[PDB]
Symmetry: D2
Subunit: 88 residues, 4 copies
Amino acid sequence: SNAMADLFDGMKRRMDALIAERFGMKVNINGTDCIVVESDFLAGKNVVVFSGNVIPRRGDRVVLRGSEFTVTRIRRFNGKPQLTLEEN
Amino acid sequence: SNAMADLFDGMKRRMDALIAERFGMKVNINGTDCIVVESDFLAGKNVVVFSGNVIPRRGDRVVLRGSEFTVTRIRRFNGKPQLTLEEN
Amino acid sequence: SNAMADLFDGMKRRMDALIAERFGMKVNINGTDCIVVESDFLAGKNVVVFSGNVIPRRGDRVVLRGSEFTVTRIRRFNGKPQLTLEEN
Amino acid sequence: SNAMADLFDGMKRRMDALIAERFGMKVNINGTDCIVVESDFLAGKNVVVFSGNVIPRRGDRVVLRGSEFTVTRIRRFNGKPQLTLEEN
């Protein structure tokens, strides 16, 4: 019952925290700093947002690796924002 | 790199398929049959949708266990539709 | 590094505790009570020992489900004692 | 039933193969080449043997990183040989 489900949830939570720790980048989205991971490591730059303190939007300017981008579209990747970014 | 990430993805995919197999219910949402799991097993009926062949919406009538419901709101649960259903 | 390895270890530890919780049986081996799981659920009765407080041996009498057995041979199953038991 | 158990087994199998891939070393034990991982990454050199084609023994000479060692003792680490090696 819950046991199995509660276990699975914790494993998923720890699994994502590890991916973010290993490949995450520090990035600024609409004024808020957060961690993102390039889609290269998981699969017009593409990245999925791991921090839970931001809600990215189409329009938002994203500073990544010193360059400015614009979130042109937003998909889902296991419930996480997958952003399509375009140079400015 | 990808190895770890590709592994994690497969584990997540298999983990959800098992939860659906063990606790999933067969239910009809807006004319389409699909599998859903009561939130009781994972945490005004509440359920998360596991089948990938439906896109639930506020308004949709849901036949569950012989009764009709209406999806009043839709949240996310690890990227899956979590529906709040009300009796008719 | 350790992170990934430490994570994997904990998942394995929790994974086994769940299997034991769901299918484990209470059994007496050479005077000590412990949990065992029938090989039917994992693959001349055959079982693997989950409790860490016993060290089974060829010769040992095992009371299981009301009947007495003798451990005729001992293999390994992911590092756990897999006992071959014969009726008395 | 088996489903959960069969899933857990596969995850464990894939989990170990990944650790070996990331930290494994190529080493010769009693004439046979195999993969080993330093205990530093998992916890008088100490290592656990991942390859399934060897059966290490006390006495065996082990060539590791260009140096010769002797397996002085053998423990278990989740069912895998954990060897204690001494310089020659």
